Ligand binder design. Structure first.
Ligand SMILES: *[C@@H]1O[C@H](CO)[C@@H](O[C@@H]2O[C@H](CO)[C@@H](O)[C@H](O)[C@H]2NC(C)=O)[C@H](O)[C@H]1NC(C)=O
Ligand SMILES: *[C@@H]1O[C@H](CO)[C@@H](O)[C@H](O)[C@H]1NC(C)=O
Ligand SMILES: *[C@@H]1O[C@H](CO)[C@@H](O)[C@H](O)[C@H]1NC(C)=O
Ligand SMILES: *[C@@H]1O[C@H](CO)[C@@H](O)[C@H](O)[C@H]1NC(C)=O
Ligand SMILES: *[C@@H]1O[C@H](CO)[C@@H](O)[C@H](O)[C@H]1NC(C)=O
Lengths: 99, 49, 99, 50
């Protein structure tokens, strides 16, 4: 609606018999491939991300936000526990850190 | 007929206005068909899986 | 068989121009939009298309509407069955009712 | 024949995701008309010429 991308702000400019907008938008640029899983098994508990997704670079699993690659260690602060490991399809094993 | 055509030329430029209006309607219909559907930039396709 | 309305209006000077985009091109546009929606969610609208598993995309949709994603990841088979039954009901209603 | 666009195929898989590491900021111009000319017609003078 307000430009192409994720809209931030606009500045109106006048025109003969009309108005001209300047939509400022946020657009992602350089994507990368990652291995993902919906949840993490830990001592028979299913951990889900509070805000973000699980990614893997081959050897370690991280929690990151959706629109930017900012990897972080899987803690109990950014994850929440729900149920056990026998329900979710595609769960993987990792050690959820606790501070 | 020819005498009808001569009297139609005496009546002026109504037919040009009607033809221009219908041409504008047709171009607007083409613009609507372009605007509703032609929003994606590249023609994606589904994987075989 | 006698004279019809389309030949009468063609002989009297009333023609019907063909549309610029044929139905094959319109179906190609809808197929491209559908494939982009299925394989990338909403990211292809914002920028470049980013692949994502469909269960994770539905978890994004559930977090958008306000339900935590463990509900989806525990009721995935029931949700898929309900979606398939709804699609079959829509195609049966379009097959039967022409109104 | 009109070309609809480039041909692309999303590499969908069961466990493959694509996440951006960088962005860009764009400025897009949208032009909209608002008002037209306020014409007025002297009907008697146009029809008759006094
Ligand atoms: C994200 O993209 C921007 C530009 O799109 C990159 O900024 C450029 O970085 C190079 C490397 O030093 C410079 O030579 C250019 O002058 C920079 N451009 C601008 C406009 O500042 C930036 O490096 C990218 N981010 C990462 C992490 O690579
Ligand atoms: C990596 O990502 C690019 C686009 O981001 C895609 O074209 C390519 O197929 C991906 N490769 C793998 C191995 O996932
Ligand atoms: C994955 O990232 C971690 C974090 O820095 C790093 O220690 C590890 O070597 C990486 N694995 C690779 C590059 O295979
Ligand atoms: C995770 O650990 C459990 C613990 O016994 C094991 O049974 C299971 O095979 C492991 N892997 C997965 C993918 O669940
Ligand atoms: C995805 O999973 C399904 C069933 O779990 C399997 O049939 C298919 O081969 C898998 N595809 C990939 C690319 O792993």
């Amino acid at each position: 609606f307000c430009g192409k991308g994720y809209h931030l702000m606009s500045f109106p400019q006048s025109a003969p018999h009309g108005v001209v907008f300047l939509h400022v938008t946020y657009v992602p640029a350089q994507e990368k491939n990652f291995t993902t899983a919906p949840a993490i098994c830990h001592d028979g508990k299913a951990h889900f991300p509070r805000e973000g997704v699980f990614v893997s670079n081959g050897t370690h699993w991280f929690v990151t936000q959706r629109n930017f690659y900012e990897p972080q260690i899987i803690t109990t602060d950014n994850t929440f526990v729900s149920g056990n490991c026998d329900v979710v399809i595609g769960i993987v094993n990792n050690t959820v850190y606790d501070p | 007929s020819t005498e009808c055509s001569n009297l139609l030329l005496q009546y002026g430029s109504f037919c040009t206005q009607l033809k221009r209006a219908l041409t504008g309607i047709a171009v607007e219909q083409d613009k609507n068909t372009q605007e509703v559907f032609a929003q994606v930039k590249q023609i994606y396709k589904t994987p075989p899986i | 068989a006698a004279r019809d309305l389309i030949c009468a209006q063609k002989f009297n000077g009333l023609t019907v121009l063909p549309p610029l985009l044929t139905d094959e091109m319109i179906a190609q546009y809808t197929s491209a939009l559908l494939a982009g929606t299925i394989t990338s969610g909403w990211t292809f609208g914002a920028g470049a298309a980013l692949q994502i598993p469909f269960a994770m995309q539905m978890a994004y949709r559930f977090n958008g509407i306000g339900v935590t994603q463990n509900v989806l990841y525990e009721n995935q088979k029931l949700i898929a069955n309900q979606f398939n039954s709804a699609i079959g009901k829509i195609q049966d209603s379009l097959s039967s009712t022409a109104s | 024949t009109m070309s609809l666009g480039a041909e692309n195929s999303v590499a969908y898989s069961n466990n493959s995701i694509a996440i951006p590491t960088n962005f860009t900021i764009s400025v897009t111009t949208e032009i909209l008309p608002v008002s037209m000319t306020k014409t007025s017609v002297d009907c008697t003078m146009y029809i008759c010429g006094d």
